[model samples]
Target: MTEYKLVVVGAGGVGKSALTIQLIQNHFVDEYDPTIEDSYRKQVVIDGETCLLDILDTAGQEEYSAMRDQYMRTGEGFLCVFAINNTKSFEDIHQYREQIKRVKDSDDVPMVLVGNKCDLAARTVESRQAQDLARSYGIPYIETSAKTRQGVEDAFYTLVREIRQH
Candidate 1:
């Protein structure tokens, strides 16, 4: 069954597109390509369970909140992608989760808080700091580096687990 419609959201340059690109390509492209905003469909197996995913990508900014409401209402789960090296994107993540809950009108919305670009050093947002916030939301926090190809697969599987849980 196509159990999930997932969206990747966060501030610009956070690697939301790269997250998907890495999953599809298995190799990172340093070139800037922003094609995922158009949306894509693919079938994936998570833990032996086959599921079809209607993957949608968003602007990852607060200015797009008007459109976010519509997107939130449709998706079964969300991947809240943010940059780890910048505190601004980290701080803005609160809005994404809040709006999702508000739009879905449900507290137990399945989601994963994604920290993108983990391959880089000097991360401005500490791991513990982000984890504590994820803890408060009762969602899984994953660090994904599309450049290094770390956590790219795990991020997808983690979000699938959340969608299946509820």
Candidate 2:
């Protein structure tokens, strides 16, 4: 049994929890608020291979910074999420990436940069900027929308595929 520990980190209301729910259960909630709570694990199989995906969905606010590092330390992989329509969330990618490096201590771990809410590109903040930033990080990037179920699975499975290959 191959187990993959993945953490989703970003500011509050960036759709971290929603992305997790959508990927695991195909459920989408219009509004989700982050709490001082821990996340649960979910299992999914891709390409006939069983994978135990333990997701750490943390509160995005800076107050939970300590707890966020705790979760990041145990993760084997990561998906740094940000809302496509929020410029601040996009800007916070630098901080998110820094935290990942500071806590995780392993740059070799496969990470996928996710831009959520792609279905609302009309009100997008800066899609190209996000892509360029992810490129600068040298990690795979994908835009996803939990509502439309677009690129949701690909964002996750692509990371898994990279892990399997390496």
Top TM-score: which candidate number? Answer: 1
- Global CA lDDT computed for model 2: 0.79
Model 2 misplacement above 4 A? none
Separate clash counts for every candidate:
1, 0
RMSD of 2: 1.7
**lDDT for each candidate structure:** 0.83, 0.79
Instruction: For residues 1-166, write the lDDT of model 2, one tens digit per residue.
Output: 8887777888788888888888887889788776564566777888998768777777888888778677777877778888888878888878878877887675566788898888885556676777788788788889899898899889888878766755
Q: Give the residue spans of candidate 1 off by over 4 A.
A: 33-36, 61-63
Worst 10 residues of 2 by lDDT: 32-41
Best by lDDT: 1
